[PDB]
Design a protein around this ligand. Structure first.
Ligand SMILES: NC(=O)c1ccc[n+]([C@@H]2O[C@H](COP(=O)([O-])OP(=O)(O)OC[C@H]3O[C@@H](n4cnc5c(N)ncnc54)[C@H](O)[C@@H]3O)[C@@H](O)[C@H]2O)c1
Lengths: 359, 359, 359, 359
């Protein structure tokens, strides 16, 4: 029996989460995507959105539409290689969602609207058992980063969890290696050079909570505060209060880069750090941390499924000769694609643990 | 008397109408902007928005804020050249706006929410005498294009009017000159190569009424239907049914161009046409239709106050040799800025006529 | 027996011809790419250029490098799928190139420096038998557009040919269908909304032969004259003097669109034209002309192998109701990719004809 | 009375220096621009380039062109406010270029091809006295940064100087303040998020000396090594070997930002640093170092003539609370505008010291 999954919110992440599932052959074997929800039930429009993607190209699998019953006016069901997905109408309140009627057990919460634990807990009243919030959460939801602290998931305690942010998923693997291998981090500040996102504006618009963020996205460099570096504190508790950073939002539609500057806890060298990151990526961080030693630019990381892709040449070439403590590490991430894979990874991990906890 | 103006909507459209008015030296002298009405009343934010523009640069005057009474916590009044503008909270119904109490006679309706004549007529109940919709209108509002048909304004009959669209304001002066000068138009098709706008999306997103328009704006050429060419029929009734057109939305934040292809009603030449357009711009179309014979690109038309800037070189170089009927005309427009000045021009024209009708 | 091919010029144009050749699975079996010629001999850089593409993604074939003889300083040979490719140095005169010694029969002339029939004829003195200029040519070189007039190729007369331009390859199939299906073309004007190209400038630069062309490419709409519509008169001689046009260069890195406005030679309808275009694309224009009836934007045509992709929705929605003569047709092209495959198609066609004519 | 100056390399940098030479209102009175030189001598083309700027808008002074002698085909003399400027033809070698015959002492070297001191010394043999390289130099030329070490100019020992790079001119004022205020700098790493430049490519192209730098500029984040931070160690000798950095080239046409992370030599706070930068900006650094406490984005710094504009909000919000040593400072620069004003500022400073000590 496949894991019965519902996706609440069918946008960049919702759809990329679905692409990941499909491409890795999980659909209908490991995971059953029972339903997807967005603004309407117009399956033809959902199919169009899945089929064509400015950044990630044409969806390579056929998407067709059909009716759940003849009593329905328009197609409300997606069909992907025989797999049927009901398109359900959005709700203001998660507890009204028919998860129980649908047999959905795991909900991927990707609207951006229910990041408060109490809000997301709505899904549990609707019949679901577990919720993965595809973003930082508030209200004490356990935060899990695949490859860093995901084994801290506890089936009997953790029902609404957060998969953190794409940025935290790039940074945390790096910091994890530094901490685990005994380099340590005394202090660190991160800058992410970040592609614009759905929240931004095409031309100067209205943004009362984020004045800079209201300015035209694809013509400016736009600074922002970010919780990503501080969030590593919750995932790697020893780093609590030692890390913060900021974002510069720049005119690319996808792919971002972390520029971490930090002080190590012991004498080391960039060469030693470089060697450790490469080893980690070949071993205990495989599939999470990758690396390159080629002359790559942002377009070259499109569709990379790793959380963090360490840039060896950028890092080795741009550090201080002979330096023992104060270093810069550069790492890339396809902010849509790697993160979406991590959501799927996390659901799979949770289901495995839930199964085990039964007996 | 300085005419008493209120602006409903102080998003980008209302903002730029205000900035154009100020640029013309009109604030506190010819026009009393009494109030702006909007979701937010944070004058500080409004002042920030006026002060800095990604496209149009720095505002020529200083903007400060103050309080309407010592009681208010956050500044709720804008000040420019000594002139106070109250920031008023938006109302669900225009009927409920305090235009009567504020002594506002003319309302610039820029929200895009009240483009139906009967909806905009609510301002009249609110206390206003006249409404200019800064967009195409429905429900029978008289449409007026400065330099083309504005003299059709009838003070006793027209209380809710439309200034049409920026595109119609580019195209109509061209068609007007072709008809007035005896070339005639048998049939025409227009293409506008158009900067992206606020209605578009940074990344691929939901756009139920415009699928193409949901796609990432700054990395796509995005076709669209448009009403601009058909609308010319309403200001030049003899072209009714002879014109239509489309748009290609492209990754520039401002400035657009009309590419008009048409059949003349008599044998002529592109040289005759070129000469007529130039003659008209220097005379009866002065301030509305301009022209260039220089090697200009879109950036060169930023902050141009004219409705239409005929590209003599692009036109003369790209027509068929010896052709007598089938022609292309190229004309530019700062889609934000010319239109803003036209909204002001129209209010001023209506005001002069209203007063002439009374005294 | 596979044909022996050399690529004069291995810039972006030459590169993509090669990738297209591999994509069709012709390397080794149908075509032998014996050598490339460039100012550069470095092969490692070539492999890097071949491996990563900002627009077209990652090359699906593994590229390694090696030496032709252990005597040479650095690698001078590319290895794709076990197939070896020599890198030779550029010559002042094409007569000096060693095609005869290399055993190369067919040369793809993609430098742009030997656009004249006489200059490109040097390749024949260098031991080659046929030349394909991957650009418009002068000096009376035969211009061949696949699916339009390629059967006009004559093995004993035509030894140096042109594959025209990417824009001509988009427009010509459209005009060809209009002519062959009996609609005809009395007059037409074409506008291409064109992605920026290598010849353009990142920031306002120097471009003495094209003043507008020197301006910042990714932030301007930039008009240009073009020869593409005129060149259709060479391919479809009945249209000589009936067609011209222009382009607007816009801020996208690849994919362009033709906007053709024309008067038919008989009374017809947009519905009749739409049906003919679709019928043609399924039959005698298969692989050259395609169509969509979906809500597509420029990204959706990336990596499309067709010369011309007719946009049925954009065409049907944006024509004049009940019109019998004056029509607009919209058609897309990946300006790099469709054309690259056509260069390869032409070579294959010339090969098989040369084979038959020798028999 | 006026300084006899000749701009060599009337490209981007050459022109903007010239515009700064006029913007300050000193053409004719204090500085006499004798001659400019690019490759062509089309005054008409030069005037067009000067009139229209994609980034900086319309030039505020009217430009005309005339002939110097009736014997030559087209004009070769520019006229700005009555002041006449000749357009001499470039030489491949600076020594062949006739500066003495023209009577030019101060030459602004802005071709970018004569960055070697020995090669740039040719200007002297050609008949000129003083040279200012508008870029970093190699071979032992004296590097001067306005507001930092410009008073180290030695009128008898320094003939071919360097105004550094725009990035160095942003970073140096910051570090200078840190050093002079007693904060100290133990170690520093700098990242510049840099607008693309003329050396970059519209689409993937050939860049043998920088593989990443050949990739399409307006659609990629492109990392690069830089010398700007190391160059500061040369201009502020107490920091030699203690600073380095890198850049990320992003899709904006102008304006850049320095992200400096450093370790102070003793206990301080971000509040003390912030207060110090503000004070310095108002005092000893006035006109070189500016600051903002507003919510600005890159477009807002277009036309700012300061070398470095410290971002107070971005700095104060994105540091670690109660930290005493490890800090991030964010400072902006119009990489075109500020630097051009400094080139003018330097020549003028050199002018006085040359005629007070050596005269
Ligand atoms: N995009 C990224 O790079 C990225 C990376 C990591 C995490 N995230 C997080 O993922 C979440 C989604 O981000 P996104 O980029 O996909 O945004 P998005 O806007 O593309 O997706 C949100 C979708 O939710 C739909 N929606 C809105 N209200 C709904 C409702 N009530 N019920 C169901 N659907 C509703 C919207 O119509 C839209 O399609 C956010 O919390 C974001 O912070 C995004």
């Amino acid at each position: 029996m496949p894991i019965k999954v519902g996706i609440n919110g069918f946008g960049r992440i919702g759809r990329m989460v679905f692409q990941a599932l499909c491409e890795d052959g999980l659909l209908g074997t490991e995971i059953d995507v029972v339903a997807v929800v967005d603004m309407n039930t117009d399956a033809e429009y959902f199919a169009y959105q899945m089929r064509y993607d400015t950044v990630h190209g044409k969806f390579k699998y056929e998407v067709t539409t059909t009716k759940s019953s003849p009593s329905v006016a328009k197609d409300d069901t997606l069909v992907v290689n025989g797999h049927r997905i009901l398109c359900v109408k959005a709700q203001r309140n998660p507890a009204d969602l028919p998860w129980g009627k649908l047999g959905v057990e795991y909900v991927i919460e990707s609207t951006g609207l229910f990041t408060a634990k109490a809000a997301a807990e709505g899904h549990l009243r609707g019949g679901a058992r577990k919720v993965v919030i595809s973003a930082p959460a508030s209200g004490g939801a356990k935060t899990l980063v695949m490859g860093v602290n995901h084994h801290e998931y506890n089936p009997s305690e953790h029902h609404v969890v957060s998969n953190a942010s794409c940025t935290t998923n790039c940074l945390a693997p790096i910091v994890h290696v530094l901490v685990k291998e005994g380099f340590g981090v005394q202090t660190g500040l991160m800058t992410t050079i970040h592609s614009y996102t759905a929240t931004q504006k095409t031309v100067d618009g209205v943004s009362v909570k984020d004045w800079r963020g209201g300015r035209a996205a694809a013509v400016n460099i736009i600074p922002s505060t970010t919780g990503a570096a501080k969030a590593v504190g919750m995932v790697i508790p020893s780093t609590q209060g030692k890390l913060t950073g900021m974002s510069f939002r720049v005119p690319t539609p996808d792919v971002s880069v972390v520029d971490l500057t930090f002080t190590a806890a012991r004498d080391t060298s960039i060469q030693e750090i470089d060697a450790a990151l490469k080893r980690a990526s070949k071993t205990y961080m495989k599939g999470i941390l990758g690396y390159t030693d080629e002359e790559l630019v942002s377009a070259d990381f499109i569709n990379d499924n790793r959380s963090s892709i360490y840039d060896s040449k950028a890092t080795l070439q741009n550090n201080l000769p002979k330096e023992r403590r104060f270093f810069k590490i550069v790492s890339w991430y396809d902010n849509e694609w790697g993160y979406s894979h991590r959501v799927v990874d996390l659901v799979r991990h949770m289901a495995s643990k839930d199964r085990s906890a039964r007996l």
